[PDB]
mmCIF file with all atom_site columns, C-alpha atoms in Angstrom:
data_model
loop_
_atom_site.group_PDB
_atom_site.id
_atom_site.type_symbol
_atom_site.label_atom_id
_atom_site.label_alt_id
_atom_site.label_comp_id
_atom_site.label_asym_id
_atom_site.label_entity_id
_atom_site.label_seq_id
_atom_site.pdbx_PDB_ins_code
_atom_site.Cartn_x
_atom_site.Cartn_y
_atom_site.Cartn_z
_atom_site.occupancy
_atom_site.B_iso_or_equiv
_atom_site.pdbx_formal_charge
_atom_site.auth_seq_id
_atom_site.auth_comp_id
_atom_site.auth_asym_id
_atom_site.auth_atom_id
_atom_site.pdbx_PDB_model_num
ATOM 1   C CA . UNK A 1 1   ? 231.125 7.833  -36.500 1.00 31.35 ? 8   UNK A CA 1
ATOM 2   C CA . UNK A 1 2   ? 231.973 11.513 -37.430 1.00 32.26 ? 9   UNK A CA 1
ATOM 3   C CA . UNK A 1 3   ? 235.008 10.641 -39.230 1.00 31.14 ? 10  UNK A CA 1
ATOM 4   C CA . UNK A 1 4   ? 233.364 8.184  -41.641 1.00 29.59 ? 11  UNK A CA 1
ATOM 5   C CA . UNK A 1 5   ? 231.464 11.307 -43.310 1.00 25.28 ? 12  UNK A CA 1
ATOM 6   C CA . UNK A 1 6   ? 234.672 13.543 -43.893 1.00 26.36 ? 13  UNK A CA 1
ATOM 7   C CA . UNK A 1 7   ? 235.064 13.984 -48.285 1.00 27.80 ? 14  UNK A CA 1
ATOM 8   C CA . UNK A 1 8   ? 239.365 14.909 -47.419 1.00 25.49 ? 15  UNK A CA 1
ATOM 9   C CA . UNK A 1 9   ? 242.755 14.429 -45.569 1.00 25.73 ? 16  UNK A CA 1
ATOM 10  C CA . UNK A 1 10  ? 242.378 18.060 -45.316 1.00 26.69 ? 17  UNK A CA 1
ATOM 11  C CA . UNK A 1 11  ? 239.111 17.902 -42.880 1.00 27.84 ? 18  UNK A CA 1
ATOM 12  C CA . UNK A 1 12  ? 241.108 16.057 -40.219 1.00 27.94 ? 19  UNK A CA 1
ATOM 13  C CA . UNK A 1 13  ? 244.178 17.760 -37.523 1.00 26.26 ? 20  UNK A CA 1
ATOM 14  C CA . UNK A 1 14  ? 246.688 16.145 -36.105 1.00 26.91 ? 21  UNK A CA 1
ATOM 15  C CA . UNK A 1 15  ? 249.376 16.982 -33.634 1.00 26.91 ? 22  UNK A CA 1
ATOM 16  C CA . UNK A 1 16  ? 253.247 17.226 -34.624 1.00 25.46 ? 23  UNK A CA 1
ATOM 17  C CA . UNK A 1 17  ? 256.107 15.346 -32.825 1.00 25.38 ? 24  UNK A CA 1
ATOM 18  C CA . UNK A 1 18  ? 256.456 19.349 -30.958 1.00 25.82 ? 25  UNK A CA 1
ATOM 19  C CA . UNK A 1 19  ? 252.597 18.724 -29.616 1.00 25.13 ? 26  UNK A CA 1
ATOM 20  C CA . UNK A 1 20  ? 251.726 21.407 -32.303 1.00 22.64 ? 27  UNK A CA 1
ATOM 21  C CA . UNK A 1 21  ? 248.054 20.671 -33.855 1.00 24.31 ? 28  UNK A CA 1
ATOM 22  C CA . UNK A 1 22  ? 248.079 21.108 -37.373 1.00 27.12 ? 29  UNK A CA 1
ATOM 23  C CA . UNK A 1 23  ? 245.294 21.433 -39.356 1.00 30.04 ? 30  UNK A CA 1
ATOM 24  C CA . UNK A 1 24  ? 245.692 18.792 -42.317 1.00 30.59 ? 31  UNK A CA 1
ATOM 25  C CA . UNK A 1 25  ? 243.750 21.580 -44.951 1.00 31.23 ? 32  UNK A CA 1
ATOM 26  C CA . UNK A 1 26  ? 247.646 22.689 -44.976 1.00 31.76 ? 33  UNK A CA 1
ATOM 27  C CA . UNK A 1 27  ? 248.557 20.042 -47.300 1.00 31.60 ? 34  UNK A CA 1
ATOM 28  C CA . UNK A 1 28  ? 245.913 21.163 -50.332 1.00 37.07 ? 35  UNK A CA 1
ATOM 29  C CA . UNK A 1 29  ? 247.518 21.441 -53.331 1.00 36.88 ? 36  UNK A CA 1
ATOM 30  C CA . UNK A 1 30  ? 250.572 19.222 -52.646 1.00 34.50 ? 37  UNK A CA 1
ATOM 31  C CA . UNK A 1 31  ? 250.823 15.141 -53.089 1.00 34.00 ? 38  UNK A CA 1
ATOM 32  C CA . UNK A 1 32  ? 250.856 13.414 -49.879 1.00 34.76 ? 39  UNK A CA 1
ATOM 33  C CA . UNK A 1 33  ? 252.659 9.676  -48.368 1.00 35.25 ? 40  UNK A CA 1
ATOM 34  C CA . UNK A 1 34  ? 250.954 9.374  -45.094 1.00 35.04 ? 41  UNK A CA 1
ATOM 35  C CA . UNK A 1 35  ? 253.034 6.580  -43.039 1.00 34.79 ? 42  UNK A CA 1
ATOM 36  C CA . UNK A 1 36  ? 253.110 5.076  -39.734 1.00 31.64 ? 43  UNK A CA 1
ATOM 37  C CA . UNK A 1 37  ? 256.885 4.790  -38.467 1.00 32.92 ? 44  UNK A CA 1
ATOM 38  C CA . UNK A 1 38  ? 258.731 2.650  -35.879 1.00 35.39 ? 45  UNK A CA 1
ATOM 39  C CA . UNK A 1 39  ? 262.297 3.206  -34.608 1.00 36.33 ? 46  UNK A CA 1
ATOM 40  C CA . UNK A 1 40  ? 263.379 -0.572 -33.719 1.00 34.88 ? 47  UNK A CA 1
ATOM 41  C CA . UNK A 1 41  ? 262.078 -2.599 -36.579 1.00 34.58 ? 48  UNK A CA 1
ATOM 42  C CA . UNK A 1 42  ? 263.547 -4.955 -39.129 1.00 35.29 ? 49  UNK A CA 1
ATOM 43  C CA . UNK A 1 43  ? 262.594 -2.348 -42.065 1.00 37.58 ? 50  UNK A CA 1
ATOM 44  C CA . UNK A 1 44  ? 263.010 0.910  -39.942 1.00 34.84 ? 51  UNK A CA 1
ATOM 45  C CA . UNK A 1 45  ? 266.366 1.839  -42.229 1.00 34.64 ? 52  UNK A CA 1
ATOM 46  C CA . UNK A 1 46  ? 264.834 0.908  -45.876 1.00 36.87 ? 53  UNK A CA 1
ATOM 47  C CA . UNK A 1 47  ? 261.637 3.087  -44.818 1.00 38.94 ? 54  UNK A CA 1
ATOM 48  C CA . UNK A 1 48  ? 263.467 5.935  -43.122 1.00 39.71 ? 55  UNK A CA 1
ATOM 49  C CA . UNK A 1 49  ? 266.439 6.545  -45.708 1.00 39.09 ? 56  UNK A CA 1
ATOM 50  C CA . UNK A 1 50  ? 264.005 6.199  -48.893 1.00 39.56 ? 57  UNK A CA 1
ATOM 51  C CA . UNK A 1 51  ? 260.966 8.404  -47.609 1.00 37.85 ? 58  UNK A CA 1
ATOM 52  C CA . UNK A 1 52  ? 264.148 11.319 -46.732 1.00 36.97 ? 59  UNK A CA 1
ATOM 53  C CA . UNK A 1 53  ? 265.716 9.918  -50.791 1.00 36.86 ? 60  UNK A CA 1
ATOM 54  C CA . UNK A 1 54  ? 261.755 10.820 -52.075 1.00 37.14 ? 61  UNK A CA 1
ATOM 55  C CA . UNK A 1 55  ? 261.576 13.980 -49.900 1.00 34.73 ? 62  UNK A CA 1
ATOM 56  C CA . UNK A 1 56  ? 264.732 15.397 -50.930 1.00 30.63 ? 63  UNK A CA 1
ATOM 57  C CA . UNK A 1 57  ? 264.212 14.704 -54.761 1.00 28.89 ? 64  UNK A CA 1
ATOM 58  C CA . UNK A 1 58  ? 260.114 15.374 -55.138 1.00 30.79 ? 65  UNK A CA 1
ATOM 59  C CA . UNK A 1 59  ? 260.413 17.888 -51.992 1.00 30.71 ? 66  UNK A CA 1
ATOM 60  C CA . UNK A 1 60  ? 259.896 20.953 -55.267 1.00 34.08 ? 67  UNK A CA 1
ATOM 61  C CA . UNK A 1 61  ? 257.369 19.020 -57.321 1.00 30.49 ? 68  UNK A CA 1
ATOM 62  C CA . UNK A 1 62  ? 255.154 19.445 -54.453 1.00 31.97 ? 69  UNK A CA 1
ATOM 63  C CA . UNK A 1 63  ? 255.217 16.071 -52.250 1.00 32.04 ? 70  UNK A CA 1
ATOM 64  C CA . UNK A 1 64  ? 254.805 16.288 -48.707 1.00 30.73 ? 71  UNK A CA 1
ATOM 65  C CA . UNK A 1 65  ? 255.458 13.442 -46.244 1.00 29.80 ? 72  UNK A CA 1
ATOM 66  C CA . UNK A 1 66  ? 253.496 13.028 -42.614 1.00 26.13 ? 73  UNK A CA 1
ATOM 67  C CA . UNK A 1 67  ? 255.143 10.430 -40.327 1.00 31.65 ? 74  UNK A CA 1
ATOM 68  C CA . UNK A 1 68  ? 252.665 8.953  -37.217 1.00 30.89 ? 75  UNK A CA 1
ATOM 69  C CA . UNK A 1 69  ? 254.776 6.974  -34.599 1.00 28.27 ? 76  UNK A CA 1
ATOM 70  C CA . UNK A 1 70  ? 253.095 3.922  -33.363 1.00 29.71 ? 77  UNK A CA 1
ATOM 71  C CA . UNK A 1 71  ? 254.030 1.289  -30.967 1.00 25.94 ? 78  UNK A CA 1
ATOM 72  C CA . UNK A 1 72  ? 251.255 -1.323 -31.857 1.00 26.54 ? 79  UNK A CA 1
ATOM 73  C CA . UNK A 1 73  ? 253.331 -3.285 -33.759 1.00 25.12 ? 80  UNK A CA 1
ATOM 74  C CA . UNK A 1 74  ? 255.961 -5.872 -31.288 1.00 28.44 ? 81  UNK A CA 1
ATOM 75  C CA . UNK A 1 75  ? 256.249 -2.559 -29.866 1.00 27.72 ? 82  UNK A CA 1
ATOM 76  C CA . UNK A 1 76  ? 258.632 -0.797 -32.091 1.00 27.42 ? 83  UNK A CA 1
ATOM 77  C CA . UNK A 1 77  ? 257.982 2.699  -31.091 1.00 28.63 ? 84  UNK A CA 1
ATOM 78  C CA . UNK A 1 78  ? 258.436 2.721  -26.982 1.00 27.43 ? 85  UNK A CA 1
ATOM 79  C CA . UNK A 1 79  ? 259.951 6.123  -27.494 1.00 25.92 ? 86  UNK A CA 1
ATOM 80  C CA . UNK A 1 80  ? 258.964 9.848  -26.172 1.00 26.89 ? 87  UNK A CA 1
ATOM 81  C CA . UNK A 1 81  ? 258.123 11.703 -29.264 1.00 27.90 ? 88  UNK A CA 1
ATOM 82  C CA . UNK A 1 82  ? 261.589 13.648 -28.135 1.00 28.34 ? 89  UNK A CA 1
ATOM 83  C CA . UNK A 1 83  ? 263.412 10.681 -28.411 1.00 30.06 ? 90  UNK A CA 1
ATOM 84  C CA . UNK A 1 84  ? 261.630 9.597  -32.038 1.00 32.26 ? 91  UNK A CA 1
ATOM 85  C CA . UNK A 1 85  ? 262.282 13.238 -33.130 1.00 31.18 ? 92  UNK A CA 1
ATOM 86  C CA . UNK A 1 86  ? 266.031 12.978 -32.183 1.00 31.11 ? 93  UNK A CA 1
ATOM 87  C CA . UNK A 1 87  ? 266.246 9.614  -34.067 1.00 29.70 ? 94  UNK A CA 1
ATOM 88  C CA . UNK A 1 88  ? 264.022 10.648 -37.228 1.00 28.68 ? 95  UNK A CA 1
ATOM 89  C CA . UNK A 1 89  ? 267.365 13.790 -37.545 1.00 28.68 ? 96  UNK A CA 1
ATOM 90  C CA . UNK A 1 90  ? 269.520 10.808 -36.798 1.00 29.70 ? 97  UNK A CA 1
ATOM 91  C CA . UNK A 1 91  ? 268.726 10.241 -41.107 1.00 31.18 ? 98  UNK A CA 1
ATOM 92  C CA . UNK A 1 92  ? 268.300 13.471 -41.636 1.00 33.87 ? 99  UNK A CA 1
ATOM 93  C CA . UNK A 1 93  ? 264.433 13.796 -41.973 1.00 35.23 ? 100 UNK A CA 1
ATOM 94  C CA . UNK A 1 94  ? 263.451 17.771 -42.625 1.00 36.00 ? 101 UNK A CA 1
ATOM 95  C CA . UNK A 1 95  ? 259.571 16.126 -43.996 1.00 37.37 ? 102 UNK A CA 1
ATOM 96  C CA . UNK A 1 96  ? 256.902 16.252 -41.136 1.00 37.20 ? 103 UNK A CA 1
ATOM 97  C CA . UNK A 1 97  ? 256.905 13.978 -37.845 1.00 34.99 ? 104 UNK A CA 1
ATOM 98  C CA . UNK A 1 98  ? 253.693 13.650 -35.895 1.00 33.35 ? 105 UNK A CA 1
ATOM 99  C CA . UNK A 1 99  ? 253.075 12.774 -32.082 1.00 31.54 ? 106 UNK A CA 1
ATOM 100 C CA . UNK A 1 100 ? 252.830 9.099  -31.066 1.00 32.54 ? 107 UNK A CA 1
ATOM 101 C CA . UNK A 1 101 ? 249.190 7.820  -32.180 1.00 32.11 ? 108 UNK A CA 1
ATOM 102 C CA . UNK A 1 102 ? 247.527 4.440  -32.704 1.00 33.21 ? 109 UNK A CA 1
ATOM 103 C CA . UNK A 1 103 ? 246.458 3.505  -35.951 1.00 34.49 ? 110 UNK A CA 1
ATOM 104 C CA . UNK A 1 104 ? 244.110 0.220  -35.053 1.00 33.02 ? 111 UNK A CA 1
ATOM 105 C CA . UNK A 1 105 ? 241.398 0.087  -32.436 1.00 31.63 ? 112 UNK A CA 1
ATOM 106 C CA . UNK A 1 106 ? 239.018 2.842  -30.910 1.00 36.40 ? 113 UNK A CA 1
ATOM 107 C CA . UNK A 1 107 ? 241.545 4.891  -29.558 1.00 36.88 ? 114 UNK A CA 1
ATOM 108 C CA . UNK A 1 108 ? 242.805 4.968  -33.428 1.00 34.96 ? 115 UNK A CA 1
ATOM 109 C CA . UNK A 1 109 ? 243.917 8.383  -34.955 1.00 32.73 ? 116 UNK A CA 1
ATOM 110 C CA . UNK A 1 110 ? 240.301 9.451  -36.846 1.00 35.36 ? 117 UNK A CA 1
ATOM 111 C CA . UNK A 1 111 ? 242.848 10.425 -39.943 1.00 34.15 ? 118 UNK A CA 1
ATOM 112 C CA . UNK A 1 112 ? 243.815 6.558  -39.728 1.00 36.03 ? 119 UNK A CA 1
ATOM 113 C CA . UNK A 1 113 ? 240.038 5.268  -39.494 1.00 36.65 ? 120 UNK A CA 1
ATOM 114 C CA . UNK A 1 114 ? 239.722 7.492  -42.312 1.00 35.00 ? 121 UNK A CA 1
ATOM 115 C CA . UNK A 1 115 ? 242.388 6.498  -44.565 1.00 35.89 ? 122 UNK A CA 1
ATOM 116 C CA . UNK A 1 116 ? 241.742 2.698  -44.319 1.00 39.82 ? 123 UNK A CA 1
ATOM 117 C CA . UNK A 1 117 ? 238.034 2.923  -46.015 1.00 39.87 ? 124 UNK A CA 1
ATOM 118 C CA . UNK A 1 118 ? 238.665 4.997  -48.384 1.00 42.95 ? 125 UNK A CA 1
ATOM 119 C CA . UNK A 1 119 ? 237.737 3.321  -51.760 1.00 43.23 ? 126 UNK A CA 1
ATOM 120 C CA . UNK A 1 120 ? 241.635 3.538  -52.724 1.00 42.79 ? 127 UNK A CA 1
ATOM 121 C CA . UNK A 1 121 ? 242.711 2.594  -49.098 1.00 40.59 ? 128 UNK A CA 1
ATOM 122 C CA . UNK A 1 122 ? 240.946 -0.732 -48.966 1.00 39.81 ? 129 UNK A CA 1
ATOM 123 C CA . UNK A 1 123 ? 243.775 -3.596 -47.466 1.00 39.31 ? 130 UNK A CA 1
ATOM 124 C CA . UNK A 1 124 ? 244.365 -7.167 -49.276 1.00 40.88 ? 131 UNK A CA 1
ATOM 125 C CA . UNK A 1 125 ? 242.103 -8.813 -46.391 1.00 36.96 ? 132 UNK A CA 1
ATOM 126 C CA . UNK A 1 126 ? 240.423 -6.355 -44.115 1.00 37.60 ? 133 UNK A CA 1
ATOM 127 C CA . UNK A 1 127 ? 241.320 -2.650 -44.067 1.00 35.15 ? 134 UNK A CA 1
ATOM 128 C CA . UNK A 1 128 ? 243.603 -2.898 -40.577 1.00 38.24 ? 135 UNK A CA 1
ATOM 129 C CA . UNK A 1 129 ? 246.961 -1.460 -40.387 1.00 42.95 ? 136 UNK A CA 1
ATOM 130 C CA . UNK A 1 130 ? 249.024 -4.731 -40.661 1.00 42.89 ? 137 UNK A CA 1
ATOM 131 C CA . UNK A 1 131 ? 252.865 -3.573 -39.568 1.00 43.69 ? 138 UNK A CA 1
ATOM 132 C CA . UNK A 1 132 ? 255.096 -0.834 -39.094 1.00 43.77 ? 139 UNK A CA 1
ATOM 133 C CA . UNK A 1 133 ? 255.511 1.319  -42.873 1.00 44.33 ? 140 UNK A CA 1
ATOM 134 C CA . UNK A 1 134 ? 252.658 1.059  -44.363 1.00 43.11 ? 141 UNK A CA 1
ATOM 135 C CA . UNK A 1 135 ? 252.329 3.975  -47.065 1.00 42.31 ? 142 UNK A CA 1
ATOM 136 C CA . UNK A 1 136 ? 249.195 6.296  -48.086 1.00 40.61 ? 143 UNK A CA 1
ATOM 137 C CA . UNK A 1 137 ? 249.626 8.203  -50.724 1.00 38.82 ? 144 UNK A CA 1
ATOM 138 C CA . UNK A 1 138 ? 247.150 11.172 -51.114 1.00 39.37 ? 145 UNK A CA 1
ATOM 139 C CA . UNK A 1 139 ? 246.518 13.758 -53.966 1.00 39.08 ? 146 UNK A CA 1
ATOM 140 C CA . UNK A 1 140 ? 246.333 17.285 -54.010 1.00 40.65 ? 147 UNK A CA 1
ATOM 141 C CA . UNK A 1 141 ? 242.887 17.124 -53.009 1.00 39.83 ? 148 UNK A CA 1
ATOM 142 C CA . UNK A 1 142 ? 243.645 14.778 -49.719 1.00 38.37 ? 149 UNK A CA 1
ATOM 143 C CA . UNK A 1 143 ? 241.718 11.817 -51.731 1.00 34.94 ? 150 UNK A CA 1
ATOM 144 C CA . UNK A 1 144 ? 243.166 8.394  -50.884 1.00 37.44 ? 151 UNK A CA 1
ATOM 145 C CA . UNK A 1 145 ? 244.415 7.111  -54.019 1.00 38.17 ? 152 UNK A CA 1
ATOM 146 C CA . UNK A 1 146 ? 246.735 4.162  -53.192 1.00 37.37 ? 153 UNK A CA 1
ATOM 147 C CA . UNK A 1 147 ? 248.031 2.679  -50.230 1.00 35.17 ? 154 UNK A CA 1
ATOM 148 C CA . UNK A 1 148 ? 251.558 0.697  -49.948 1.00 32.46 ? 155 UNK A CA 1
ATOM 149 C CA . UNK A 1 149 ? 252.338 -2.343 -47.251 1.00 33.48 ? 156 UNK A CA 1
ATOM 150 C CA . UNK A 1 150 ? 254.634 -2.580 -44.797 1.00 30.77 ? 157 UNK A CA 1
ATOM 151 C CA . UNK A 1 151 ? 256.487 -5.005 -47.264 1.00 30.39 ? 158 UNK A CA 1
ATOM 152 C CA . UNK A 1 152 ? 256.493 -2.411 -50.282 1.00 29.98 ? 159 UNK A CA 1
ATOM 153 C CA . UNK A 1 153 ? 259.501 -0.229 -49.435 1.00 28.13 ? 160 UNK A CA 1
ATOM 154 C CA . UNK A 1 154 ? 259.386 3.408  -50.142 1.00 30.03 ? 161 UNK A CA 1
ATOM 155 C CA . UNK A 1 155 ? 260.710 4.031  -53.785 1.00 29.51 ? 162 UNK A CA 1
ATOM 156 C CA . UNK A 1 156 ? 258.253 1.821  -55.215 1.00 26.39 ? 163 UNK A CA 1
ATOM 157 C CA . UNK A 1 157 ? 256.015 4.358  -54.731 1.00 26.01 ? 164 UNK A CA 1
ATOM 158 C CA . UNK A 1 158 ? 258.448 6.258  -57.218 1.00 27.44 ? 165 UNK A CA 1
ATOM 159 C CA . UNK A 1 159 ? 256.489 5.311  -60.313 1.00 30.29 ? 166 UNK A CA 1
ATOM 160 C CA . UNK A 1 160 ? 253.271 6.555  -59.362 1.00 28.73 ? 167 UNK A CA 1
ATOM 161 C CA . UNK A 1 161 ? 253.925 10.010 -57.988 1.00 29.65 ? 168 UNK A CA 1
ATOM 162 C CA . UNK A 1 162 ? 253.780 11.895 -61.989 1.00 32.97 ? 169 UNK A CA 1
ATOM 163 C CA . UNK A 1 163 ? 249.690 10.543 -61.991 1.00 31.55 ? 170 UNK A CA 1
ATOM 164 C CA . UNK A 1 164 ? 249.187 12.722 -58.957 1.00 33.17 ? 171 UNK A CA 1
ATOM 165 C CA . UNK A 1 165 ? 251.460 16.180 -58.933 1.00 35.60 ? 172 UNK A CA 1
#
């Protein structure tokens, strides 16, 4: 498949919670946690209220958050994107929420079949997505250069941002 060839984050679009496409090449240049979200799961407030406490403090050193909704996980996400945009401002989010997408399967984001290969995006036993929250966190050149489980909250992540800006 197409997507296995692509070098970057930045080769791939996606389209925002407003059904805007953007063209990922707008992130070059600034560090990147790529996450899926979910609205009605046990770590929904951990995730939410420390990727906003990581926005709001690295925001100026130049990271940049992308949230994917996805309901493939007990079905977290039933949501409209409307509804998931009105609850992200519920903590005060100002980083960047994308449409409803699946992460898993055929019908699986390319981004996310990307991300999940990449030599620093392997998982601990196969590369699927296994829950709500897992983290990607991509450098200034949209490499994959760690990825975070759904069981690693946010500000972990803390430590390794300086290797990347």
């Amino acid at each position: 498949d197409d997507w296995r060839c692509a070098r970057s984050m930045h080769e791939f679009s996606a389209k925002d919670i407003d059904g805007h496409m953007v063209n990922l090449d707008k992130y070059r240049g600034f560090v990147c946690i790529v996450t899926n979200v979910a609205s009605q799961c046990g770590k929904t407030e951990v995730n939410y209220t420390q990727l906003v406490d990581l926005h709001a403090r690295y925001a100026e050193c130049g990271l940049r958050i992308l949230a994917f909704p996805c309901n493939q996980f007990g079905k977290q996400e039933p949501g409209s994107n409307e509804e998931i945009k009105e609850f992200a401002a519920g903590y005060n989010v100002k980083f960047d929420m994308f449409s409803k997408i699946c992460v898993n399967g055929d019908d699986a984001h390319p981004l996310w079949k990307w991300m999940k290969i990449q030599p620093k995006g392997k998982g601990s036993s196969g590369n699927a997505i296994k829950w709500n929250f897992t983290k990607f966190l991509i450098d200034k050149n949209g490499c994959v250069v760690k990825r975070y489980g759904p069981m690693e909250e946010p500000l972990v992540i803390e430590k390794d941002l300086p290797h990347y800006f």
